[PDB]
Ligand binder design. Structure first.
Ligand code: HEM
Ligand SMILES: O=C(O)c1ccc(C(=O)c2ccccc2)cc1
Ligand SMILES: [Cl-]
Ligand SMILES: [Mg+2]
Ligand SMILES: [Mg+2]
Length: 393
């Protein structure tokens, strides 16, 4: 009843151009079986959304990578938020919600916006730049480590650590094995910075530790919650901002609409998250036998959710393969959905909005003018290099 497919959604050929295979995954049925990895796959919008909103059956506490924590040892201690189900999830989630709250955004917005404006002006003085190294990476590196309260020493480990984290949710392919092997120096740096003495008062990390006084988290939970922000809060934004710039470079008509109304910046960023889906996939594990789209899945099975596919499903989206900065984006699953929906979404949107606002006000054209290179990761979609010429407004 369930179709069996040989598509490897973690192969380099798939990463290089996933769209035909994602349509094959959607059109084969609401649920497929991926023989390459012995997992179920769910690629249409409706079923992806339903699974994400059914946490008592499609759980996170057995891991959201391929590995099942009831069968294998996790490569690092489990995340107290990502890899937990309610009720254990709830209080750690509340702490990160408050640390990354609407009220907190007020305290960082001026500096985040000023840094974005300055970066765009700096890049305009160069003209021809690499929108990854010089923009998508440089901007978050200039604001997020400081907002976390990290010391200066060791920050070179942050992007390597995040790449490792995101590769490690994948299957045990070469990308994963290479990432985990000799990763101890990156782990040691991150784990050290999670300790309270290393985090500047007033930053996100110190604020997490301050919540240990309230009874929401114990002192020994705080370092792992700092670890969550250092795992999930940098490389995601690099790929989100890179996605938005790549969209504006390829759709000049949409750049022109953004220039004419810079208040579209926030939705232009949200649409880039839908369109590229910088976080492509994650897993759940069934806690019981369950029917999904007519297919019966046994207990203890891994289920792979294709967020990028759901975000392009023609059953749900008109003109899904068009980047449209005025699209009604609500309901896209690029930040997930339900109880685990990205707790950092306000930080992500703040960074994306202020960068696109700076581009909207300062740049007249974005032209690809060198070889584009894709970056491969088991979970993240994005570019390694994006040479562009920026023309000033
Ligand atoms: C464009 C940028 C981002 C994207 C696309 C993104 C995507 C996601 C997705 C899809 C999830 C859900 C995972 C699941 O359901 O298993 C998630 C969760 C999470 N994200 Fe983000 N994220 C982004 C930025 C950030 C930032 C900036 C932070 C922190 C500063 C952050 C921290 C987290 C955390 C801690 C979780 C776990 C939440 C929970 O399990 O309750 N993310 N993110
Ligand atoms: O708590 C953490 O360490 C953590 C939290 C969230 C993420 C994340 O966005 C993500 C994880 C797995 C798959 C797709 C996205 C990764 C790590
Ligand atoms: Cl670690
Ligand atoms: Mg260890
Ligand atoms: Mg010291």
């Amino acid at each position: 009843t369930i179709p069996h497919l040989a598509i490897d959604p973690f192969s380099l050929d798939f990463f290089d151009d996933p769209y035909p295979d994602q349509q094959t995954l959607r059109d084969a049925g609401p649920v497929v079986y991926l023989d390459k990895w012995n997992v179920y796959g769910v690629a249409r919008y409706a079923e992806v959304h339903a699974v994400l909103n059914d946490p008592t059956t499609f759980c996170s506490s057995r891991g959201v990578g391929l590995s099942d924590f009831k069968k294998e040892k996790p490569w690092r201690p489990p995340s107290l938020i990502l890899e937990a189900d309610p009720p254990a999830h709830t209080r750690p989630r509340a702490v990160l919600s408050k640390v990354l709250s609407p009220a907190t955004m007020k305290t960082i917005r001026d500096g985040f916006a000023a840094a974005a404006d300055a970066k765009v002006d700096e890049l305009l003085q160069r003209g021809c730049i690499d929108a990854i190294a010089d923009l998508a990476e440089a901007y978050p590196l200039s604001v997020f480590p400081d907002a976390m309260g990290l010391k200066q020493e060791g920050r070179e480990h942050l992007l390597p650590y995040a790449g490792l984290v995101f590769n490690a949710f994948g299957p045990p392919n070469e990308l994963r094995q290479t990432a985990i092997e000799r990763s101890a120096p990156h782990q040691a740096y991150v784990n050290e910075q999670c300790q309270r003495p290393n985090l500047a008062p007033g930053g996100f990390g110190a604020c997490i530790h301050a919540f240990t006084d309230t009874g929401e988290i114990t002192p020994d939970e705080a370092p792992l919650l700092v670890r969550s922000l250092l795992s999930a809060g940098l490389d995601t934004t690099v790929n989100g901002i890179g996605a938005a710039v790549y969209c504006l470079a390829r759709f000049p008509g949409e750049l022109q609409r953004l220039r004419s109304d810079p208040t579209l910046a926030r939705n232009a960023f949200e649409e880039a998250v839908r369109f590229e889906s910088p976080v492509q996939t994650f897993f759940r594990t069934t806690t019981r036998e369950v029917e999904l789209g007519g297919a019966v899945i046994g207990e203890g099975e891994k289920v792979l959710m294709f967020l990028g596919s759901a975000n392009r499903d023609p059953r749900r989206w008109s003109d899904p393969d068009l980047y449209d900065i005025t699209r009604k984006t609500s309901g896209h699953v690029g930040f997930g959905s339900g109880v685990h929906m990205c707790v950092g979404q306000l930080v992500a949107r703040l960074e994306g909005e202020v960068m696109l606002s700076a581009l909207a006000r300062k740049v007249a054209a974005i032209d690809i003018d060198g070889p584009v290179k894709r970056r491969f990761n088991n979970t993240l979609r994005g570019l390694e290099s994006l040479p562009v010429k920026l023309t000033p407004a």
